[PDB]
Amino acid sequence: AYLKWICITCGHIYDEALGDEAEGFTPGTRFEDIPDDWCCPDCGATKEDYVLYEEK
Ligand SMILES: [Cd+2]
């Protein structure tokens, strides 16, 4: 059950089964294993801007 995260900063949803394609988010990367090193592909901030969509 891949979870998704929405960046409250802009409103971008992340699909654990399809994260970023330019950085290299292979299909199967849970936000848990993605520390702050990863940022938003539309903004460029830390992970604090991303939250869990439903099922929290
Ligand atoms: Cd964002």
39 is in an annotated binding site: no
Interatomic CA distance for residues 54 and 18, integer angstroms: 18
As for how many domains the chain has, the answer is 1
Nearest CA to 12 among 35, 37, 43, 36?
43
Range of the domain at 26: 1-56
∠ CA 45-29-44, nearest 5°, is: 10
Distance 28 CA to ligand 1 centre (A): 20
Helix, strand, coil % (nearest 5) of the chain? 10, 20, 70
Q: Is 10 known as a binding-site position?
A: yes
CA 1, CA 24: separation in Å to the nearest integer? 21
> CATH no. for residue 10?
2.20.28.10
Which phi-psi region, left, alpha or beta, contains residue 44 (left: φ > 0; alpha: ψ -120 to 50)? left
Is 40 labelled as part of a ligand binding site?
A: yes
The CA–CA distances, whole Å, from 30 to 3, 41 equal: 7, 16
